[PDB]
Amino acid sequence: GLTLLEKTLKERLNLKDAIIVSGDSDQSPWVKKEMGRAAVACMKKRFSGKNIVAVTGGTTIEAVAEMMTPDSKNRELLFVPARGGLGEDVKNQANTICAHMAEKASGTYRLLFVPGQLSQGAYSSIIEEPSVKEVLNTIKSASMLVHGIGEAKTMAQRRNTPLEDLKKIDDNDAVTEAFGYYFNADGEVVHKVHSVGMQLDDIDAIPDIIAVAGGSSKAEAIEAYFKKPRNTVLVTDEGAAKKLLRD
Amino acid sequence: SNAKDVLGLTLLEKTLKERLNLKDAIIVSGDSDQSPWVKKEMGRAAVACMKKRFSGKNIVAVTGGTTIEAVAEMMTPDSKNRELLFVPARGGLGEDVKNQANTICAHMAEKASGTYRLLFVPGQLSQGAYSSIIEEPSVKEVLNTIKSASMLVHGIGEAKTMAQRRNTPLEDLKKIDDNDAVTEAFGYYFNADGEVVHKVHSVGMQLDDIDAIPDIIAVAGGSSKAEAIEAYFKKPRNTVLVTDEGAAKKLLR
């Protein structure tokens, strides 16, 4: 079963399960690929006959997508982004990762097409539109969520974060981020990126949540994110886990 | 080409060009309805055709569909490093996301190491929602770009197949059936004489606009498309066709 390290991590972070691959992805870049491989195997163990898989962007979930292969059980797979624009560049956007993962899985996918510099009026018009509402409804019915976790400062800087929001993130001592929410050390939301789709309150209804995040630089972010019960499986590496656990 | 010569394609292309009054005909071996690699070979041939026709600066309008996706897949950067901007020819045509022009456009531009501009004007907008969005600077910008397209690369489909693949409202299915549409290109359904009998309403390029595009490349093959290709070319289109033997031989038989 679990190693002592995995067992300790599960207990410390109140995880549904812990999956720890060897090495430190901050040292040892290819370790991110090994997290991806392990995450893909974890997803396959969890699939039901039909599945609606919501995904975030970021480089770690892109590694999940890169390691994705078709399901030998041939279960029904529909992929969607978890949320609309989060300010990421194209290679990091949930829409990009979603399409890549679905293609690799030989599944189907839907995208959220919500710009992106357009007006308030135009914005509200886009989100009321039938095809968009359809995708929003699909995300609301997700059976699985696969998501990254990042350091708050790092993520705020990588994205196109307004200066007033950077100030708010700093002033409120955000230390971690996931799916467009920034959290403090006690895992409480302190700032949220406005975006349609999945909300934090919605994750409780999703049967299988798999977080994929590692590297020693993220040990503090991961600990803080899991300070609240998330009922989540964490795929991580020794770099993060040993640092977090002081081992 | 000696390869084309020995395979009988040089003659077949001459015969097809003359039969359809094409600007030129490019035919690859085999039948894409039977052999999956033949579609990739159409893509490769289309890319060669595009590169031959690029100028210093290019605005390339593209449609969606699996055939133009194959063009995108076979695309490579321009060894001459000419300026390439890719745009979808029209907005939402009711395709699933994989087959949408926006999807093919992005893929093509990435493979060409060019730039792209997408058009997000959904087909199911209310009248009021539409008025709002059409005035957005970002939307006006893309529509304006499309208006200056220097090249169009488009697929051709059987009317019935396309009507079923897109989510076509019942009333429109009836109209397509009642007017005996046999072919489809860029959201227009045409009869056997190449006359428009149904138009999917959508912003961007309209049929009359193709006359101002100096280089138009249609990419479509497989035996199942022989009649559709023949019907589309019943009118002058000033177009180069890339196809396969499957479509060409059947059409010519």
Ligand SMILES: O=P(O)(O)OC[C@H]1O[C@@H](O)[C@H](O)[C@@H](O)[C@@H]1O
């Ligand atoms: O995996 P990376 O590149 O460190 O990025 C992680 C972040 O990527 C973001 O875009 C996701 O929406 C977040 O869930 C995540 O925290």
Ligand SMILES: O=P(O)(O)OC[C@H]1O[C@@H](O)[C@H](O)[C@@H](O)[C@@H]1O
């Ligand atoms: O290449 P396929 O998959 O046969 O699809 C062709 C059709 O794809 C549609 O999306 C295009 O707008 C048409 O120009 C074309 O007829």
